[model samples]
Target chain A: VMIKLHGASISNYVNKVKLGILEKGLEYEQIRIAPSQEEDFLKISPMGKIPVLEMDGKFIFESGAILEFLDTIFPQTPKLIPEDPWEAARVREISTIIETYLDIPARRIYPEIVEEVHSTLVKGIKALQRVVRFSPYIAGNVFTLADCSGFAHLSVLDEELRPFYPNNHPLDLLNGWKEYFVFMKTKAGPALVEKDKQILKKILARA
Target chain B: VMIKLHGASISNYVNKVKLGILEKGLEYEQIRIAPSQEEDFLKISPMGKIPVLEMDGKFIFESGAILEFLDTIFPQTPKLIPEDPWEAARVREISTIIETYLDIPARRIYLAKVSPEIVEEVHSTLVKGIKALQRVVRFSPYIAGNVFTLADCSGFAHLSVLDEELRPFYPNNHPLDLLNGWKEYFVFMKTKAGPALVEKDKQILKKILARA
Candidate 1:
């Protein structure tokens, strides 16, 4: 069965699945769908959420689930999750802590935040720094599925973040997260993100 | 191999793994470490969290991972997560949405606002969490599938916690009501996850309440 992902080109969510597929070394077709409730798109994703996976004539929505599915499907080249349960928990702790305290909060402090939300951005960067210190990778070093999850949000945060939050300070404080980001950018990360962005532009244009 | 589960009887996190064992029909010994960090318990779980699984001189912490590992190890009886990629992702979505937005916010309200600070953060967090939950959760018959998955197994304590702290949020305007198969499955859980467990959890959490 040919697995296809239907989402906009630029969506951070779309990039998440794209990065996962790249990490797993899978060659699946990428389908750029303008996210909508239009009958055809609705047939694939009822909720109008981007980055739905189509496999065997069915759709799977939600980024978290998409990443988990990718990991489980190709277990050979590398394990996305840590092998030991303790290390696994550490990965989870980092993931959840990033999702709950860091990413979600950073997401919340968004375009609305603007210049006035400087404090919020500062707090968010510091929080990211703290997670980096503890994490071996983003979710600890081995490039678990969580790195994909955390990086997607971090990219969104970094979009408006890097100017105010310098890379040097973050690199110094965080446990090699900047270094990891550089690597991801080198691989399928930045190119895939650019591809996703182009797709997102097309989607928003229709809107 | 003797499977020893370090759990406080009433913990949903602990129950997370218990439900997996029950589904797999695996025989394991229960080690009552309760909640909170004893000097001894800290050796196993540095976080001092409950629901650590031990087998063959190895420790498996984190309730969610434990359940998933058990399912993979004992591929018998019922499967908690689907074998297919898409189906498994849907199953994971249920747990991720619950753990990320709903349960975590509700827990913060319980810990920080209602108990410790009695601050306004409680009201806003609950409001936002419920709204986000409406967007994600599907409560029909079972949480994820025709059969109970690790999602249902992980939520026992969380549901109880919700009932205790935010009953008003559920059943009414709570999107959880939209779940078609919820009532019967929930009733089943009441028996499988009963009052004894509830009482024991309260006994353990009292310290957490008193501490902050």
Candidate 2:
């Protein structure tokens, strides 16, 4: 049975999962649907979040869970998570920081607006700036789940926050972020960006 | 070298990691420090969040990450994550949902003085969240069924904290009451790891109130 991923490419969370699928070289169907509060969508995704994976008659939501499942299930591809336990743990630490500090908080003030002091985005930026060696990848030398999360999240944040803090977009504020974002664009980033543009064009044309 | 866990006990995230430690029966040191934005704390935990774990001179922050690390390092201790791929994913699904839906949303209204509508707004989200949880939760014996997993750690901590914080206003219609399985789940948790968590939670709350 072919794997079906239900989400539009525009969502960072959706792209996070899509990056993993692409990295693994998996053959899957992309169901372009925006998350909604409708009963059916809610049944599959209780939080009404995007990027639900349906495989073998089983449906799973939460991008992190789906990514982990993909990595675990599809062992033939380049491993998203490392075999070494410590490396895997470090990857998870960065991934969690991306979700908690960067993506989650950024959502609260996407496109325009900012939360100061304990702003999740601010703390996320500070942490990534301090912790990320980049070394050509967000977490380390080898590309892992953390890079997927970082690329998907930080790229969007770069766009949304650039207008608000023109001179100090996080991508520019941190050298590692700039380098990593550049690297990601060459990898799976361009494909997802193109898909997002196509979806946006369709929506705009209909309106 | 013993495991060192930093953060005050009152924090739900701290307790979530602590629950995993206690469940695994691993010997660890709990450092009682409130989460703060001080340079020293932020030096380690960039988010200034509670429940950072130190083992063998290495540090890792975030309750979920710390929990995963502990389960990995102390494989001899009862496994917090199941070996089966499907079961593990399901456990993670529940754990993530509890944090994203139940804990995160509820924390927004924890101690803030808010209007009835604001309170109602939070309540509505929790109801929807809980209803979604009910769909996947298998409390036949333990949450997520068969063996106790990390989901139970997050589940019990978030529910107990939400109940304590929300009971002051909406005493009659506690959201947990809506789910019959939740009531039994708490009882089972108490028999397992509840007593220690409850005791520490109280001590931390008392200290917080005294400082206030």
Candidate 3:
């Protein structure tokens, strides 16, 4: 289809989209790049963030938006987001909580464990617990976009926050996430994305 | 239809959805709330953020989700998202930027008593976001296009909060002023009755919080 996904696999965001791509069995190529603040990169991703999907010479940035584009454009494949309005809202609700509260606040810690951010993450975890159901999947019985979001972002989150909290990391606070995280790793998409991320990290380490 | 808007008047996200509820001429009871960690509140809103829209015993959270749901579920109301895919994506993009880059960083101004250096950094981040937003926000009349859309709801709610709350801290350096057409956009938003109601509640809570 001549589709190209830009940005390095090191980005949990890039990994999120890659998981959807692999799961949907969409034939695409990885551009293997990093985020840039240059005017050229900003044209595609205003924030200059990773994981832009190039389709028909058009660029879609932001993982959430890209997923929306892929799902709508390729309805014949697996549904990353459900077609039903309420179910769709639930999936988006999960993604928003994770990215807005969990991932967004989690990013600032690396780049406080500052009480404000700390407390915000704590609040975020409790919120996810309230809505998240793991009937072997993050959102529900289905492996929708939330799983892609939960697995990629939370795995990175758990690893990063490990040394700080040790015994009681925030990711552990979600009702069944510890087990869910491990369970998701056995899946094909997670394994591929994880291996790609590790190799990218490994290559970057040597450089 | 039995509808209740659960959230504190001060929350922009709540008001973001509230603007549409009123614009749609939907009669709703306002049930005020601060984001609660309590189980009951969490049951309705996973993150305990609001304004949560309760309709016929069903709960809708996430202001953006609620906005999208409202437009879709109630087709008789003024449509906020465009039917065109690219246009809809553009609407989502503008709101995403506002919430992620502009609002999240600005929240630090009120989240805690922080050192001046941190606020300065946040202000700088917001300025960059505003400039980047200037590159996209089509103040051609509305935030997204010629017709008012969900992006305008998000834009008015968050941008007004930045003007009032974030402005107090930044003085003349308020980032919204730095955006090319925001001042004109702000005036345009003021002309709308729903936004007028939104701004009034914002000020009402501003005074209420001043004493408390």
Candidate 4:
């Protein structure tokens, strides 16, 4: 089955799945879909989000679930998670913490900052710092999917709202979270970010 | 070392852990810490939530982690989970579905609705949650257990919360008791994790009932 990732290049979520594909060395082509209520692409991502993974014609939306499925699918060299249940659960726990607490809160709030409603983004970043346990990688130094998630998402977080937004070093919320993110950045991530900036410019112009 | 579960008697989360304790036949004491910002209680529960199981001083928050730790702590009795990784993961995946998707969304909407929201919050929580739960559970005398497992504890906590709180508000709310093993197990929970012996828990149930 051909793996086609439906995502706009600017979407950090698209880069999230892209990290897994590149790391696993799986062949897949990118299909750009604008994140909107447009009738055509709505069928693929009902959440109206980008970086939807289309595998064998079925679309999986949640990035965390998609990453788990990827690790299970490619169970070869450089294991993303240990086979042990407790350790794996611990890793899963970190991902859950980030997803529910950090990511969800960020999603709920970031748009406000992006729309310039909330003047302070630092509180949200500090909230993340309170929960995240950074021991080299977001989980630990295996470069598991958490790193992929942390880097892909948090990079966009820092880039999109820094300097102008009221935060000390938005990256400061994460102690080494920034350094490791830089250490882990893939060429695909930067290229996609640049492509997204161009598209976002057009969209923001109308705004 | 004595196994002490530090949580309120009225909490479904505390009761969820209690069900695990009962299944394992592990001797433990339930410490009733009233909800507060007090220093000692805050030290025990940083989040100011219930069901903090203090075994030799290590703290595990999140009832999901607490249940897993309890099952591991007492290695005897029946196995709380399947031995295989994928099976265990499937178990966790289902339980996570209950915890995050079903139970969480239900609690959110229930809290919003029964308390009176300024805007019209949709009553879609129970339909979404129960449908998700039915995909995983069978109440048949024992949930996931030919005997009993973590699933029962997860099931009992969720169903009790839903039936007691959310179900009355939304009539179309799927009766979890209508599920495969729900009736028999509901009877079992009455005898086991039920209100018969646990008067404090019954009091808490009354509060939720009063909220409606």
Q: Using DockQ as the measure, what is the rank order of every candidate, best first?
A: 2, 3, 1, 4
Residue A132 error, candidate 1, Å: 8.6
lDDT: the better of candidates 1 and 2: 2
Off by over 4 Å in 2: A111-120, A188-207, B193-212
Residue lDDT tens for model 1, B53-124: 887787766777677777766778578887766657767766665665556666665452344344345545
Model 3 ranges with Cα > 4 A deviation: A111-122, B205-212
| Segments in model 4 whose C-alpha atoms lie over 4 Å from true places | A1-93, A109-133, A144-172, A186-207, B34-46, B72-77, B84-86, B112-120, B144-147, B171-185, B191-212
Give the lDDT of residue A113 in candidate 2. 40
Alpha carbon RMSD to native, model 3 = 2.5
* Candidate 2 per-residue lDDT over residues A1-207, each given as its tens digit: 389999987788887888888778888888989889898888888778898999988888988989888887897646888877777877898888777777776666652345362255555677766567688887778878887788777777777777666764554656667666767777754466546755775777662
What CAPRI-style quality would you assign to candidate 2? medium
Give the number of the best model, judged by TM-score. Answer: 2
Residue B12 lDDT (model 2): 80
Q: Candidates' DockQ values?
A: 0.24, 0.69, 0.60, 0.15
Error of 2 at B189 (Å): 1.5
**Residues A5-89, candidate 3, lDDT per residue (tens digit)?**
9988889999889989888888999998888999999888888888898888988777887887777677654687776778778
**TM-scores of chain A in all candidate models:** 0.73, 0.87, 0.92, 0.72
lDDT of 2 at A33: 91
TM-score of chain B of 3: 0.93
Tens-digit lDDT string for candidate 2 (B34-128): 87889888888887778888887778888887887778777864577788777888889888878888778777788466878888988888888
Q: Give the TM-score of candidate 1.
A: 0.68
